[PDB]
Ligand binder design. Structure first.
Ligand SMILES: Cc1nnc2n1-c1ccc(-c3cnn(CCCCCCCN4CCC(c5cccc6c5CN([C@H]5CCC(=O)NC5=O)C6=O)CC4)c3)cc1C(c1ccc(Cl)cc1)=NC21CC1
Ligand SMILES: [Zn+2]
Lengths: 316, 120
């Protein structure tokens, strides 16, 4: 526990992707139980919750063509929740709306970098492969406790030190996205239409929590739920994209064990401006769990905070 | 202080199995953490080291390998795997075993050996 000189707003802005992007403030919300056809992203495999922000970067020519049609029409695409990542099988998912767009031609190759926020949950009804091979999905929109928030906010304060939303639906989603749980429980919470049942199940899930180890060798305990802290306005778990185009969901913790640091600190493509990253890997499997962040100025109170990739962790 | 031939003008051209090697290069180019060394030709004047090219007669880098793979300079896959292996081998000569660069190259050489065992 320490003071924060960092600005929680700067990480959310995603300055690393760029700064001079076009902003759309129009909002589109379809009516409940209505059926809609939405094109899906071909490379994304994450499970997006409403209100979460997704930074994106696309290189392939078929993908820039879909984004250009989307900006002309309603700016809405579908991100599915797959039970098996290798398989394309899905049952549920959430819509995403583009609020930020930027085109760039780097060395003659067209580049799009977009930022989107999830809006409405849905149920997959059918998914056909388009002639260009970019599957479009027919889906159906799904319709959607003060004492309960108290108990959750109380326990959450015990884990780490008005940042949390006040509305019921908004608070349930915040907890679901930032909880250190398995993706199987994420799908289960998404399937829960009402907010009351979702909040009660989140309370039960958080009371019984296990430490995290590496996925490859499963022999080294990395961190616990008590080391979690929120360096961003979105919370402890936020999504950031690397320069090649792969999006990472990074958990920010204050202390971690059983990890060796390889290399020297550098600031290139830093998801948190003002800090330098050093690659960390497991002392047994050497699986490159996350990056350790070291500050560049002595004025920042959090001089060192760990950053772990959710994809390389499995609860014990 | 001289760039290796990236593309020829008189050689023949064949297109078989070099597509699979482009998928291998894509896995190493983008792993990507330690790829920024061996990315571009080693630069002696910026590094201060005035003994690298005297120790290593042949310069091989991932980008040179990429450019030759596009102009279809290689007619046989062996020449590619030999060139990739030469890049790693050269690092192990100039650098001692405790150096980080020697540790970085080992991970890439492990990935390269794993993916080059699925040849079609
Ligand atoms: C070959 C050879 N053989 N011997 C030698 N070399 C060398 C050759 C060249 C250079 C060199 C130096 N400078 N530059 C100058 C060349 C510099 C090229 C640019 C390097 C930085 N960019 C690549 C890595 C980053 C990146 C890439 C992929 C994914 C992710 C990220 C970040 N990233 C995350 C990280 C976490 C985060 O917060 N954000 C992210 O986006 C990612 O997800 C992106 C930025 C090149 C040095 C050497 C060295 C050497 C090398 C390293 C160290 Cl430590 C010490 C010595 N040693 C020798 C002389 C003996
Ligand atoms: Zn391990």
């Amino acid at each position: 526990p320490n003071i924060i000189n960092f600005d929680t707003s700067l990480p959310t802005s995603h300055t690393y992707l760029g700064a001079d992007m076009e902003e759309f403030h129009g909002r589109t919300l379809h009516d409940d139980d209505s059926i809609q056809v939405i094109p899906v992203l071909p490379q994304v495999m994450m499970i997006l919750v409403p209100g979460q922000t997704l930074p994106l970067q696309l290189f392939h020519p078929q993908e820039v063509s879909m984004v250009r049609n989307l900006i002309q029409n309603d700016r809405t695409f579908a991100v599915l929740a797959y039970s098996n990542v290798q398989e394309r099988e899905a049952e549920f998912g959430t819509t995403a709306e583009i609020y930020a767009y930027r085109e760039e031609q780097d060395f003659g190759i067209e580049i799009v970098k977009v930022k989107a926020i999830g809006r409405q949950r849905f149920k997959v009804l059918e998914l056909r492969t388009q002639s260009d091979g970019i599957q479009q999905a027919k889906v159906q929109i799904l319709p959607e406790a003060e004492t309960l928030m108290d108990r959750i906010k109380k326990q959450l304060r015990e884990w780490d030190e008005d940042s949390l939303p006040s509305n019921p639906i908004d608070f349930s989603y915040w907890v679901a996205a930032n909880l250190p749980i398995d993706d199987s429980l994420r799908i289960q919470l998404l399937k829960i239409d009402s907010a009351i049942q979702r909040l009660r199940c989140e309370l039960d899930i958080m009371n019984k929590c296990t430490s995290l180890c590496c996925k490859q060798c499963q022999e080294t305990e990395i961190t616990t739920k008590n080391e979690i802290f929120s360096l961003s306005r979105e919370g402890p778990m936020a999504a950031y994209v690397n320069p090649h185009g792969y999006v990472h969901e990074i958990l920010t913790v204050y202390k971690a064990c059983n990890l060796n640091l390889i290399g020297r600190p550098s600031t290139e493509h830093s998801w948190f401006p003002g800090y330098a990253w050093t690659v960390a890997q497991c002392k047994i499997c050497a699986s490159h769990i996350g990056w350790k962040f070291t500050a560049t100025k002595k004025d920042m109170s959090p001089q060192k905070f760990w950053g772990l990739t959710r994809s390389a962790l499995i609860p014990t | 202080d001289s760039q290796q031939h990236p593309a020829p003008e008189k050689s023949s051209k064949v297109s078989e199995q070099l597509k699979c090697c482009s998928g291998i290069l894509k896995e190493m180019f983008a792993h990507a953490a330690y790829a920024w060394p061996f990315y571009k030709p080693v630069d002696v004047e910026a590094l201060g080291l005035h003994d690298y090219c005297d120790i290593i007669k042949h310069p091989m880098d991932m980008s040179t390998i990429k450019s030759k793979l596009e102009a279809r300079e290689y007619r046989d896959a062996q020449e590619f795997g030999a060139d990739v292996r030469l890049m790693f081998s050269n690092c192990y000569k100039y650098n001692p075993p405790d150096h980080e660069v020697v540790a970085m190259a080992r991970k890439l050489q492990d990935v390269f050996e794993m993916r080059f065992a699925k040849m079609p």
